[PDB]
Each structure stands twice: as structure tokens, then as C-alpha cells.
Amino acid sequence: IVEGSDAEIGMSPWQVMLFRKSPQELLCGASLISDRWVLTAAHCLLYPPWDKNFTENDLLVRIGKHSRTRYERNIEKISMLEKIYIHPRYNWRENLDRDIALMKLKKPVAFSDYIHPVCLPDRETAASLLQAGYKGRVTGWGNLKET
Amino acid sequence: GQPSVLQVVNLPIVERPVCKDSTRIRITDNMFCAGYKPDEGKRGDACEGDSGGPFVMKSPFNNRWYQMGIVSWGEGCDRDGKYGFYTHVFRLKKWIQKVIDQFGE
């Protein structure tokens, strides 16, 4: 995030971190929508131009985190993936149209003060809120500068 | 640099026209863009490493947080006159309902 500020503890309990098993590195962000499902972008898993094409066993999901680097004992939960679903019509060839993917956690995750699911919008919430000028919030452990 | 802790930034949704006109990439209805316009004098943007993260809004009607977008692509990060594009979650909601109930808990 460029020009952002540090999140408060528990300010975004659904933020998930996609972590590569080896090299151990941060791949992407994601979000928790239920005790067993994580929503992320399909380009995080499949992007042929850059030879990217990850499978369940290549990843780990870290839930309840604040620190980018640290293994936060007693706070974060790390889960393994059972199945990855990429939208059938995800367009990587041209414009990343329908850039979405669902990941099934191998075992349901327990909620706490730091882990809690976000709501998915319904037609009426979407209509009233997705309007020009309205502010939304983005969160991540990514780059602070393009440069 | 890469941050020590999780970062946050609040960004305004931008009008579809302003979005198409800032890039040469073909925009579809499954995407929306967000960020400040150069004259607004405020900045912010997702960048590398933020991909796949949530773009959320808090409903004023029920006080709950809803995930409206997924950090997708951009050309640079916080470049003046450029915006971040997000996957329009609601337009892909039927696909989400269907793999969930057809594939699990």
C-alpha cells in the first residue's frame, strides 16, 4: 500500500496472507469469507506470462496476522489448502477479466478477536454503495513504493 | 520498502469513464477502479504484494463490512492519473455461491 498507515490490531480480521512454502515468501493477500473459504485474485495462483501456476501444496494460508515478517504465536493460524478453484472464464491473456479464485481450507478455522469473516454483498448493498465518490478501504503487506 | 505491519488506505470509487480513459487496457463490467484524481490532492494505491487483498466498505444501514472488490491490477502504483482496478465481487457472486454449495462447507 502506497500512502497508507499502519492498521490497528483487529481492524481487518478477515485479512489473510498467501504464503509460499519454499522459498518462504509473501505471495498475495486474500480474505476470509467463512470458516473454510478464502477469496483471492486468480492471478495470485495462475499467470502464465510470468510462469506462475501454483497448486494447493505450494501454498499456506496465514490468518489473524498483523506483522508481515513475524510468526505471531498464539495469534495467527496457518492452514493448508484442500482445493483451489479459478473462475473458468478468467482472462489472463488480455485484461485479467474475472480475476477471482476460491481456496477451500483443509480444516475449518476458529474465530477469535483477530480472525472473523467479512460479508459478501447482496444486490441491494452493492447498488447503494458502489458509487463514484464513495470510499472503500484496501489493506495489505505489499510495497510501500512502486520504486 | 516492505512494511513492518499491515497497512490500510481508504480510496474513493472513480466513475467508469474516467477509468477507461486512463488506460489502453480494455475495461469490462467485472472490474471497477479506485483512487484519487490528480487534482483532488490526496494519494494512495495498492501495489505489488497487495494483489488478492480485500477492497471493503462499511454499510451505513446495518454497520457491517462488505467485500466489494479484490485488488487486481494497475500500471505502476500511485501514478498520477492512473487508478487501481478491482474485481467486482458482486457481479461474480453467482459463481461464488455455486462453487461453495456445489463443493462444500
Partner: peptide, 30 residues
């Protein structure tokens, strides 16, 4: 939509505490 308790943060909405910038979000919704 979303889960039964979805979107109500344990450390904020549930204790009726607001985070530092959510007011900016709510003020933008006309």
C-alpha cells in the same frame, strides 16, 4: 449477504468502538 456474524469485528463493532478512519468512509456516503 455473507455469514451470520459476518462483518462485525470482535474488537470494534461488537464493543461499539470505532477505528481511527471509518468516519471518513461513512462521511463519503453522501
Amino acid at each position: 449477504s455473507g455469514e451470520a456474524d459476518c462483518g462485525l469485528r470482535p474488537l470494534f463493532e461488537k464493543k461499539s468502538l470505532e477505528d481511527k478512519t471509518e468516519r471518513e468512509l461513512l462521511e463519503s456516503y453522501i
